[PDB]
């Protein structure tokens, strides 16, 4: 399972991850497609151990984080380096995600 971040741990996590690529899966409890893509995401995370995969439940508890990050679509994916968003995409499109990741952190 992917490491879960919250409104109080999100930015401290990105602060301490230096410039390693961080892939954030923003999901919700009502998001069908999120449940469809999740086992593939876990799979990818075990293969690409050079990239960080984490997840954020956009809910009322985390509502300030979702507003601050301007989350619109469930799921949304952000890629981060050095505390800074280098890409994003929406929807459960694992093909597109893998291509986005390889364009920022090519394997091997």
Residue numbers in the entry: 72 to 179
Manuscript excerpt for this entry:
The crystal structure of CrTRXf2 was solved at 2.01 Å resolution. The overall structure is a flattened spheroid of 49 Å equatorial diameter and 25 Å polar diameter, and conforms to the classical TRX fold. In CrTRXf2, the first active site Cys (hereafter referred to as CysN) is located at position 38 at the N-terminal kinked tip of α-helix 2. The second catalytic Cys (hereafter referred to as CysC) is located at position 41, and it belongs to the same α-helix 2. In the CrTRXf2 structure, the catalytic Cys are covalently disulfide-bonded in accordance with the non-reducing conditions of the purification and crystallization procedures. Trp37, Gly39, Pro40, and Lys42 of the conserved 37WCGPCK42 motif arch over the disulfide bond, leaving two gates to interact with the solvent. The third cysteine of CrTRXf2, located at position 65, is perfectly conserved amongst f-type TRXs and was shown to be modified by S-glutathionylation. In our structure, Cys65 is likely in the thiol form, since its side chain points inward to a hydrophobic pocket formed by Phe33, Val63 and Ile78. Detailed comparative analysis of the crystal structures of CrTRXf2 with other TRXs revealed that the f-type specifically (i) forms a rougher surface with larger cavities, (ii) orients a crown of electropositive patches on the two opposite sides of the active site disulfide, and (iii) adopts a local flexible hinge downstream of α helix 1. These specific structural features of CrTRXf2 should guide the recognition of specific targets by facilitating target space accommodation, flexibility, and electrostatic interactions.
